[PDB]
Amino acid sequence: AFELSAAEREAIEHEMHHYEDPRAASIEALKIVQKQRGWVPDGAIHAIADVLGIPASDVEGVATFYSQIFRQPVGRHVIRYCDSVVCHINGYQGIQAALEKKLNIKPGQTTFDGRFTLLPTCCLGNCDKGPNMMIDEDTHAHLTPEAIPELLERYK
Amino acid sequence: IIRTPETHPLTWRLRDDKQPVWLDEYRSKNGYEGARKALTGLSPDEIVNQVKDAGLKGRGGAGFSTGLKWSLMPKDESMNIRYLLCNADEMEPGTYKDRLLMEQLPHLLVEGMLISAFALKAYRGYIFLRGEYIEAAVNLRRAIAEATEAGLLGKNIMGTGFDFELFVHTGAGRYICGEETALINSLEGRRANPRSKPPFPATSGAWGKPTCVNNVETLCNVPAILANGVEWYQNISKSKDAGTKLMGFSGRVKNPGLWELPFGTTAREILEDYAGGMRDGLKFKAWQPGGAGTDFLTEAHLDLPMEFESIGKAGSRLGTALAMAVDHEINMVSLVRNLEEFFARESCGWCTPCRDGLPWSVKILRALERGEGQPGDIETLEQLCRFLGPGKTFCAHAPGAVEPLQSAIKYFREEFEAGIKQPFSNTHLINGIQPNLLK
Amino acid sequence: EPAWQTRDHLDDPVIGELRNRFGPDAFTVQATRTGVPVVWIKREQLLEVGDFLKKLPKPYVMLFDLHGMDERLRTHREGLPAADFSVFYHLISIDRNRDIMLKVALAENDLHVPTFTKLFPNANWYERETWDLFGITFD
Amino acid sequence: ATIHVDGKEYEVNGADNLLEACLSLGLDIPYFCWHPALGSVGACRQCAVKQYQNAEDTRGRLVMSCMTPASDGTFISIDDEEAKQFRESVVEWLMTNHPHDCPVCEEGGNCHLQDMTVMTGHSFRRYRFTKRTHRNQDLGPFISHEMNRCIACYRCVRYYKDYAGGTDLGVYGAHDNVYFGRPEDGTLESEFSGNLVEICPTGVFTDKTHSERYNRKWDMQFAPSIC
Amino acid sequence: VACNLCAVACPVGCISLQKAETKDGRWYPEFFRINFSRCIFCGLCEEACPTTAIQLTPDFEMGEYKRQDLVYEKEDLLISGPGKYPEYNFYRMAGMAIDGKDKGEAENEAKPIDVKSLLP
Amino acid sequence: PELAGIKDAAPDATFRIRGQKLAREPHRYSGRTAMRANISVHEPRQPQDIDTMFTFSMEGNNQPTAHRSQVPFAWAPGWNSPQAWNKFQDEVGGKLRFGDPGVRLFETSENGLDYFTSVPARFQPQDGKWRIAPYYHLFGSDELSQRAPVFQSRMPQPYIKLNPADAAKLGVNAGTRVSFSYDGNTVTLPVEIAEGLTAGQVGLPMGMSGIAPVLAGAHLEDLKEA
Ligand SMILES: Cc1cc2nc3c(=O)[nH]c(=O)nc-3n(C[C@H](O)[C@H](O)[C@H](O)COP(=O)(O)O)c2cc1C
Ligand code: SF4
Ligand code: SF4
Ligand code: SF4
Ligand code: SF4
Ligand code: SF4
Ligand code: FES
Ligand code: FES
């Protein structure tokens, strides 16, 4: 059971105002639902399909195509550590090891309380200040393994 | 390091406190004068001809000339619905130039999109921005709001009757969205499978309409051409590639950053005179000129100008001209394994060789990393490199994927040959069945 | 060139001898993997071709085989003469250590060939079997 | 139009692409993603031939024949060694993740993928790693789903959506985890969903009604009848 | 697995069988009959079997009083053990899910990755 | 004489391809000495087909280049899939080689009919009467298709379709059972609400259990809640 809120529907329709085809607002509609509810549940695909007038298979294919549209329940905070080449040169592996030691999880899954979830991510476009890590809205550069506990303690 | 407007057209108005320049400060530092000249004194065909004669090539990595791409637009007046897209995705690893360009000078990008939309007769413009550039999105939206507040965007721009609306479309985090036809597909809210050419996006792009996709940096050099003149732009450097370029070395160097240099600048000048060379106690081993999709080059190629044709004959691509340096401490098998893991997880899955041959190379490189390599693995990698080239795959993601692999095999074959420790074994013995002992 | 490669055997001296005796348009050379020159001979020239091969300096002394073939359902007959049926004659020259196949095309209604029993006495049972299993008359 | 295939002249229709023109002449080019009714999209990269600029050209270039128009005076080669090796490599790349399923698969003896694996002459496996797997969906009483056998040729989605007008079948996922099916388990809504069993070149979509009393194609007695 | 490869590989056509499926989803012969009055003991069915189910064994004493009794049904062919090939199991290699063997549990198979998973 | 074209639909039983009939089963048809061995070890006589040009055996022709239009199945060597129809066509995606089977009975007339002046009046919803709107189903309207056991799961439960205004007039909701009598046969069906239906009409699924397709356009009496 999934009911869209009034604010979500208003934002989705305002995004449909920006394009000449309502299908073009599918990515932003999924992002709006994800921003409001943490992720995109199974009924959200059908709700966006009925709002946009496009089939639910198209919305599901878009949601499963893109990496930042979550189709599984995540924690209240998302760690996104850059595993790309420049951060590998600058030692992202120590950062990943420190994150695995602190969270006591493997990458891809969530903690037992749903407080963090850990994700290897693409290049963040901050390679001159590598290694980099993206918490929910904040980018962090010049990472050291010792700074992981003092950086992760400010996100509850 | 001084930055005059005559030799640093893209970075001379940058602020020393790393703060963005808004509309009043931009107009103070010679802002929207090229847009005013273009909209009040030039026909759109004249602006396209000036961009073509200025030698402005693309900055996304392909290096195609902007004037030739703009000249592919149809001459029919019946199709007045036209789109201009700005590839602000910057999803290539090793690239951080568009982030600097939009996080601190958004009005330069807005003015360039305005000029290019007037030149292309484009009625709408979209900035396809990645979802990780939150600050760049905020700055671009504020700059757009200030531009329509001052009448620089919307209906009847500068009293000329030209209507242009600019939107910011934030992406959902996929590398293949940077491909121009795949960018068009993701703009339409579809899966970012790239399209085949012909037909080109100029003939029928976004929603079947004439559409031109250009990089952030190209639309940043456009106002400099339209303001300071064409003959000023051709006389920036004595090279076949006219104009400046955002170049810079990154990765375990003394000064990892980004600077604006004319074309023809040698790679050793960027590494030594700008990046300060390698860090303490690090021996330089290799470098990539244009990010993750470019071939590795050795220290012998460091005395080469950073032009498209110069790096092309060396066996690599100039790309985004943002070079990355690899020292002696890094194992090349591990680095190419990380690169191929990126390129195999960022496949779009449309076409067979990339989708089913990049993971095979990934697993081979994983085996070479752990010392579990078997004979025929390097031959398999070379076959994959020659069978994932241009034309064999549907788009250019897989040739750019296999370029570092073949370059590392060509220059550092002893590191790949050191991972082969086990004999080849594909079958296990089945009791009662004698195997066919092939020789 | 492996042993199974499709050869035309135009370098065989028997092909040159047949060309010098009967002319270049009297027969058609078929490229096969049989290892022998396969030569489609017109029906009216079959007896003189067999006599000419029997009177060679190193002659084809043995009729190795003689049998028919129903070619009505054969779809890949490119480069072959039009034939509802055909009769092949495999001859061996022991002195040359060579062998040649001669093929005679036959229409569906006109299923009769001149007999080979005068040149080779062992053609009798082969022609009896070809008549028995294909209906090809031997005059 | 006039084409030259392997040095032999052929007269074809210029409006067709190269793959359908060559298949109309009896030439055998392997192909997966192209269908005569669905058009060409150039996904599977199986139909590769070598095209030359003129008669006096030796290098050439690999092109997809399904996406190459059969223009007048077009010089190509199917039996070129490079094109044969690339087509064999495409079949091999498809074969790296394919399940060991032919005896217990309803498409055996009727399988386009089997026919093109044999046609390319690829019979030796040099891939020693793991193969990806997928869960299956319930598509209703008619179509049985087996996602492991997929080669990502996109024929099902193109037919069911662009041709049949259906809405509930689609492609999900990414790089090598592309999934073809419904977003959830349920009956395929289209009245023409049964043609997926002939559109799909593999054993992903199979006739479940036939799969109850299954027999192989060589064991059937057929007749030309009218529905 | 009732794949009918032995039946078609038989040049005499003396093997008849029908595929049936259990509830877990494994294939098996509903019936299996060999007409041993026709069989030439050529071993082509054993050669064509991809599961090593059908085997030709060292036993020559099969004389019968009635020719109808030379038609051996499945109850006369199925033995208690693996015969000449002791360890091969086709369903440990096949990709279909059966009882005791789910998806990704066969040889050289990875676990199925859902398209909804958070990893790229 | 109006059916004189059906002679040319297929050739007669004397039709041969180079003297041989057309095969019904493929070349590798298996088990010919064992499918009936449980009944008797003696092989039965092959069934003779005197009616048609086909034979109940492999002893026949199914070549893709055979001069015929009736093709029992597509198979070419190296093409065992449904893609062998490419081998059976002159050009792929076109017609069958040597023509498609079937012949049109009638040609287009030179002169047409006249305009039908019998223009009907508007639909008048009369109380007591109920116009039966036909609702056809692909799985359930054809009789023999209904007899197929696999269609029983695919076919839906029979729902009598009602307008929201008419359902409010009867007071019946969505899912409740109402009973109606036609030809002295009181049968009951559960109600599904059809908004697109026009008031004064009641929707009936045709071909189903008890609902004959002759009810299209037929009036209805005694629509009451059961
Ligand atoms: C896999 C792939 C990824 C790409 N990513 C980007 C990108 O992130 N940003 C970009 O400007 N161009 C990218 N490109 C290049 C575009 O296809 C296109 O050439 C460019 O965006 C616009 O051309 P321009 O340089 O003339 O402006 C990518 C190309 C490929 C094949
Ligand atoms: S090479 Fe093929 S599968 Fe890979 S990203 Fe491009 S179109 Fe997609
Ligand atoms: S789809 Fe084809 S290749 Fe795959 S298991 Fe089935 S018969 Fe074999
Ligand atoms: S399910 Fe079948 S038709 Fe669809 S992409 Fe896979 S192989 Fe092709
Ligand atoms: S051994 Fe007997 S049953 Fe087996 S293939 Fe030969 S004749 Fe047939
Ligand atoms: S005995 Fe072997 S070949 Fe015959 S049906 Fe069973 S598994 Fe197939
Ligand atoms: S490589 Fe990590 S930010 Fe670019
Ligand atoms: S058939 Fe041409 S690429 Fe698929």
B204: CATH: 3.40.50.11540
Say whether residue E120 is in contact with chain A using an 8 A CB cutoff: yes
CB contact under 8 A, D111 and F80: yes
Q: In this complex, which of E115, E116, E119 lies closest to A108 when CB atoms are compared?
A: E119
Per-residue 3-state assignment (H helix, E strand, C coil) for F153-172: HHCCCCCEEECHHHHHHHCC
Residue E12: name the closest of E33, E32, E52, E41 by CA. E41
Does E6 reside within a domain?
yes
Q: How many CB atoms lie within 10 A of CB D162?
A: 12
Residue D148: name the closest of A60, E100, E112, E1 by CA. E112
In degrees to the nearest 10, what's the CA dihedral of B271, B273, B275, B281?
70
Size of interface C-F (CB pairs under 8 A): 7
**H-run or E-run covering A52:** helix A42-52
In degrees to the nearest 10, what's the CA dihedral of C53, C54, C56, C58?
110
Does E13 reside within a domain?
yes
Q: Alpha helix locations (H) across chain F?
A: 143-147, 151-154, 164-170
Resolution (A): 2.7
Residue D81 exposure: Cα atoms within 13 Å on the Cβ side: 2
User: Can you tell me the distance from the alpha carbon of B214 to that of B122, in angstroms, rounded to the nearest whole number?
Assistant: 13
CA nearest to F30 within chain E: E8
**What is the domain range of residue E15?**
1-93
Q: How many helices (H) and strands (E) in chain D?
A: 6, 9
Residue F73: name the closest of B177, D220, C37 by CA. D220
Q: Residue B120 in contact with residue B48, Cβ under 8 Å? A: yes
Q: Are strands B244-250 and B322-327 parallel, antiparallel or unpaired?
A: parallel
Does residue B373 share a domain with residue B356?
A: yes
Q: Residue D12 in contact with residue D21, Cβ under 8 Å? A: yes
B278: CATH: 3.10.20.600
Q: Residue D87 in contact with residue D48, Cβ under 8 Å? A: yes
* Cβ of E49 less than 6 Å from ligand 6: yes
CA nearest to C71 within chain F: F18
Residue A29: name the closest of A52, A55, A60, A61 by CA. A52
Q: How far is the CA of F36 from the centre of ligand 5 (A)?
A: 17
Domain C13-139: give its CATH superfamily.
Answer: NADH:ubiquinone oxidoreductase Nqo5 subunit (3.30.460.80)
Q: How many CB atoms lie within 10 A of CB B85?
A: 24
* Cβ of D116 less than 6 Å from ligand 8: no
The owner of tokens 């449980």 is F38
Q: In this complex, which of E34, E67, E68 lies closest to F34 when CB atoms are compared?
A: E34
Residue among F18, F21, F97 with most chain C CBs within 10 A, to mutate: F18
Size of interface A-E (CB pairs under 8 A): 23
Q: C38 is written with which tokens? A: 């396969």
Q: F174 is written with which tokens? A: 């969505």
Does B167 reside within a domain?
yes
Say whether residue E113 is in contact with chain A using an 8 A CB cutoff: no
E119 contacts in chain A (CB < 8 Å): 107-108, 119-120
Does B266 reside within a domain?
yes
The secondary structure of D107-127 as a DSSP string is: TTTS-HHHHHHHHTT------
Residue D90: name the closest of D124, D45, D128, D149 by CA. D45
Does B295 reside within a domain?
yes
Q: In Å, how far is F110's CA from the nearest CA of chain E?
A: 58
CB neighbour list of residue B14: distance below 8 Å, 6 or more residues apart = B3, B21, B104, B105
Strands (E), chain C: 27-30, 38-41, 62-70, 85-93, 98-106, 112-113, 137-138
E112 contacts in chain D (CB < 8 Å): 132-135
Instruction: Give the domain ranges of chain A.
Output: 6-65, 77-153
E5 contacts in chain F (CB < 8 Å): none
User: Can you tell me the distance from the alpha carbon of B105 to that of B220, in angstroms, rounded to the nearest whole number?
Assistant: 9
What are F220's strand-pairing partners?
none
Chains interfacing with D (3 or more CB pairs < 8 Å): A, B, E, F
CB contact under 8 A, E87 and B430: yes
Residue C139 exposure: Cα atoms within 13 Å on the Cβ side: 9
Q: Residue C124 in contact with residue C103, Cβ under 8 Å? A: no
User: Can you tell me the distance from the alpha carbon of F112 to that of A2, in angstroms, rounded to the nearest whole number?
Assistant: 59
The owner of tokens 């779009």 is B348
Does E116 reside within a domain?
no
CB neighbour list of residue D109: distance below 8 Å, 6 or more residues apart = D216, D217, D218, F80
Q: How many CB atoms lie within 10 A of CB E96?
A: 23
Residue B128 exposure: Cα atoms within 13 Å on the Cβ side: 34
Cis amide leading into E112 (omega within 30): no
CB contact under 8 A, C73 and F19: no
CATH number belonging to the domain at A6-65, selected among 3.40.50.300, 1.10.260.40, 3.90.180.10, 1.10.10.1590: 1.10.10.1590
CB contact under 8 A, F80 and D115: yes
Count of the separate structural domains present in chain B: 3
Q: B186 is written with which tokens? A: 């993701």
Listed as own residue / partner, the contacts of C112-115 with beta carbons closer than 8 Å and 24 or more positions apart are C112/C136, C112/C137, C112/C138, C112/C139, C113/C43, C113/C46, C113/C87, C113/C137, C113/C138, C113/C139, C114/C43, C114/C46, C114/C47, C114/C138, C114/C139, C115/C139
Q: D54 is written with which tokens? A: 């003129």
User: Can you tell me the distance from the alpha carbon of F211 to that of F213, in angstroms, rounded to the nearest whole number?
Assistant: 7
CATH class for the region spanning A77-153 = alpha beta
Q: How far is the CA of E5 from the centre of ligand 4 (A)?
A: 25
Count of the separate structural domains present in chain E: 1
Does E36 reside within a domain?
yes
Say whether residue F92 is in contact with chain D using an 8 A CB cutoff: yes
B169 contacts in chain A (CB < 8 Å): 27-28
Residue among E111, E116, E118, E119 with most chain A CBs within 10 A, to mutate: E118
**What is the domain range of residue B409?**
332-418
Q: How far is the CA of E39 from the centre of ligand 5 (A)?
A: 5
Identify the burial level of F38 via C-beta atoms within 10 angstroms of its C-beta, where 0-12 means exposed, 13-18 middle and 19 or more buried: middle
Q: In Å, how far is B191's CA from the nearest CA of chain D?
A: 9
CB contact under 8 A, B196 and D67: yes
Does residue B261 share a domain with residue B197?
A: no
DSSP structural state of residue B251: S
CA nearest to D176 within chain A: A65
Does B284 reside within a domain?
yes
Residue B311: name the closest of B303, B69, B257, B90 by CA. B303
> If you take atom 6 of ligand 5, which residue's CA is the nearest one?
E42
Cα C49 vs. chain centroid, distance in angstroms?
Answer: 9
The secondary structure of E18-81 as a DSSP string is: EEEE-SS--EEEEEEEEETTT-----HHHHH-SSS-S---S------SSGGGGEE-HHHH--SS
Does E113 reside within a domain?
no
User: Can you tell me the distance from the alpha carbon of D190 to that of D212, in angstroms, rounded to the nearest whole number?
Assistant: 22
Does E109 reside within a domain?
no
CB contact under 8 A, B251 and A90: yes
A117 contacts in chain E (CB < 8 Å): 118
User: Is the sign of the CA dihedral B358, B359, B361, B366 positive or negative?
Assistant: positive
Residue B106: name the closest of B132, B69, B133, B83 by CA. B133
Please give the method by which this entry was determined: cryo-EM
Does B439 reside within a domain?
no
Cα–Cα distances in angstroms (integers) from residue F159 to residues D49, F119, F137, F192, F217, in the given order: 57, 33, 12, 6, 18
Q: In Å, how far is A64's CA from the nearest CA of chain D?
A: 5
Q: Residue B391 in contact with residue D60, Cβ under 8 Å? A: no
Q: Alpha helix locations (H) across B193-293?
A: 216-228, 230-234, 267-268
E2: CATH: 3.30.70.3270
